[PDB]
């Protein structure tokens, strides 16, 4: 009803639209949406990353629904869309559950789907204690270390990030709680950290994380490494800011609770 002809340029965005109810408002998405089912089909696709201004020009948009972690590479492109009078919105970047919910907020309010975007906050809430509830009432303080790059540094996530702070819902502790954002580390510091499992984010297989790590000296000794709690996620996936966080947040309680 408010808008009509809507682009969506990441796909949690495109996921949060359909469950407002107005998928059939939208007229383009990114070449990397893939939920839900089909979503391509009968739609434009425009690359994030190389934005065609003529095509998204010719798609007569009333809505290009972006996201803050596009500002620097879209944002080149979108800001021509802007001065012919399409309303850009940039979805800020959620690094928590707590935030997530926010931008469901902001784009039903956007979208005058306030209603819509309530009742998709509280079943996600739902979904996501769903979850927080099976872990169980007694279990061993855990640490775990988040590697979120490996090569050449290592880095990890502290705090103010999106797997802290599913971490923390999951009642586990963060070995780096101390830094904030993603920073990296020293090879030596994880190993006086000493983690109780090993979590790679950057969506490599298990077996191959598990190669890297038996090549880095010094792991050898780490609780993690000694109890084989070497884990990998796609991290890209599991915090993904939208409808399905649930899911995501599901994978690495599996991780951290065997």
Do not use: C
């Amino acid at each position: 009803k408010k808008y009509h002809r809507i682009i969506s340029l990441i796909p949690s965005n495109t996921e949060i639209l359909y469950r407002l109810g107005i998928g059939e408002d939208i007229v383009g998405v990114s070449t990397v949406d893939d939920y839900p089912k089909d979503v391509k089909k009968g739609k434009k696709q425009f690359d994030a990353m190389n934005l065609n201004k003529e095509e998204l020009i010719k798609a007569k948009p009333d809505l290009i629904l972006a996201h803050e972690s596009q500002k620097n590479s879209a944002g080149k492109v979108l800001k021509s869309l802007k001065d012919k009078g399409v309303k850009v919105v940039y979805v800020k970047d959620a690094q928590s559950i707590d935030e997530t919910y926010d931008t469901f907020k902001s784009i039903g309010q956007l979208t005058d789907r306030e209603k819509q975007a309530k009742e998709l906050v509280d079943e996600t809430k739902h979904n996501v204690d769903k979850i927080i509830n099976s872990v169980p009432k007694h279990h061993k303080k855990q640490e775990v270390f988040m590697e979120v790059s490996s090569k050449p540094d290592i880095y990890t996530a502290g705090k103010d990030t999106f797997f802290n702070d599913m971490l923390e819902k999951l009642d586990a502790k963060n070995s780096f709680d101390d830094v904030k954002g993603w920073k990296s580390v020293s090879k030596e510091s994880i190993i006086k950290r000493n983690p109780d499992i090993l979590i790679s984010t950057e969506g490599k297989s298990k077996s191959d994380y598990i190669e890297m790590i038996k090549k880095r000296g010094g792991f050898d000794k780490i609780n993690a490494v000694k109890n084989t709690r070497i884990e990998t996620v796609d991290g890209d996936e599991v915090s993904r800011p939208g409808p399905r966080i649930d899911e995501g947040l599901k994978d690495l309680r599996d991780d951290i609770y065997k």
